[PDB]
Design a protein around this ligand. Structure first.
Ligand SMILES: CO[C@@H]1[C@@H](OC(N)=O)[C@@H](O)[C@H](Oc2ccc3c(O)c(NC(=O)c4ccc(O)c(CC=C(C)C)c4)c(=O)oc3c2C)OC1(C)C
Length: 347
């Protein structure tokens, strides 16, 4: 039942505004992209206060539950991250979805969380034309305001394109008429490269790496920027960790050890000078994406990754990869080392 959600909405979403509800719907479309089924996601914010999310994924199954004898889509919508789309339906005066699947376009409507129609066959489409679109009308009585924080949504949607290479994410704000489109073929590297295009850095095209250990998967892009504002973003299962944490500590620790060993072999350290992790990390710009099973968060807001396992995993990945890179790019390596050494010497 959805009654519990209606009684205490604050326990299932952020009642400040409907942004979180939109996130839930967006996440479901992103899963299709992460699974390699969707390549396009469009979000529309309407003047009537509703929000729609459309994707070209497989589309929600349009079959009937043998026991419940009702559409599988109905069970999903009638029965913070990963709370489920049912929460969106429960806190909306109306929800309308269109599903393109198996050569047909289907429609279903809900009102105040209850089915307001049957699963209707409303169109015929090509076999390859599939996807889901869900539009919801948040019930203002549950939120301080029905208005969306568009800026926060822009940042979040861009992250999806960054974290899922090849995915095109669009946003359309009907109130203003403003449109946005994000796409990053390479993912992390293209995004970081574009965000730092105004400053000179080492490597010029960044230092990239990745490692998969059957459950743990890490991806990163980093560079040293002598002058300029640094971009520093980390994620765990697509969840942004504003306070970074154990995964970032691993990256930092691993790049530091590689650089220190490099300075040792090349004998670049001035008399009595030793590199401290802060010397190496001070001018670093990066984007880090970790994927692990059941991550644990710490901090007064759970915006920091606490999983100790993640530290050792990434440290080993960054250590081995950066050592390899430095040893095959000596000049670039010595310039990076010098940036860190200049800090150490300046102390
Ligand atoms: C809110 O629905 C979300 C989806 O939302 C979006 N935007 O696509 C998406 O996040 C994901 O969608 C899935 C998740 C799993 C399968 C999946 O396992 C499929 N393969 C099947 O063989 C299948 C075919 C019919 C059927 O009733 C079921 C069981 C239904 C499930 C597991 C939801 C599975 C399939 O064709 O489509 C799938 C789809 C579209 O999971 C949902 C349904 C909770």
């Amino acid at each position: 039942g959805l009654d519990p959600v209606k009684r205490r909405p604050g326990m299932y979403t952020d009642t400040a505004r409907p942004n979180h509800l939109a996130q839930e719907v967006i996440d479901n479309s992103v899963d299709e992209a992460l699974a390699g089924h969707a390549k396009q996601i469009e979000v529309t914010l309407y003047k009537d206060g509703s929000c729609e999310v459309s994707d070209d994924g497989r589309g929600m199954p349009v079959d009937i539950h043998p026991e419940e004898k009702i559409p599988g889509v109905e069970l999903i919508l009638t029965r913070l991250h990963g709370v489920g789309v049912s929460v969106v339906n429960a806190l909306s005066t109306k929800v309308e979805l269109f599903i393109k699947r198996e050569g047909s376009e289907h429609r279903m409507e809900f009102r105040d969380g209850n089915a307001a129609s049957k699963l209707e066959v409303v169109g015929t489409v090509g076999k390859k034309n599939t996807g889901t679109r869900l539009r919801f009308w948040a019930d203002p009585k549950y939120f301080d305001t029905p208005k969306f924080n568009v800026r926060a949504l822009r940042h979040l949607l861009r992250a999806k394109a960054v974290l899922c290479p090849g995915l095109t994410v669009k946003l359309h704000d009907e109130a203003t008429g403003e449109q946005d489109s994000w796409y990053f073929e390479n993912g992390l590297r293209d995004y970081l490269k574009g965000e730092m295009a105004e400053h000179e850095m080492l490597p010029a095209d960044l230092f990239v790496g990745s490692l998969k250990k059957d459950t743990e998967i890490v991806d990163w892009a980093a560079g040293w920027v002598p002058e300029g504002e640094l971009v520093q973003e980390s994620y765990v299962n697509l969840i942004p960790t504003a306070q970074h944490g154990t995964h970032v500590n691993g990256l930092r620790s691993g790049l530091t050890d590689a650089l220190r060993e490099f300075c040792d072999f090349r004998n670049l350290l001035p008399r009595g000078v030793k590199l401290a992790p802060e010397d190496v990390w001070d001018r670093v710009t990066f984007v880090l994406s970790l994927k692990m099973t059941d991550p644990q968060f710490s901090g007064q807001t759970k915006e920091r990754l606490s999983s100790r396992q993640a530290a050792g995993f990434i440290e080993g990945a960054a250590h081995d990869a950066f050592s390899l890179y430095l040893n095959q790019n000596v000049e670039i390596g010595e310039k990076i080392a010098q940036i860190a050494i200049d800090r150490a010497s300046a102390r």
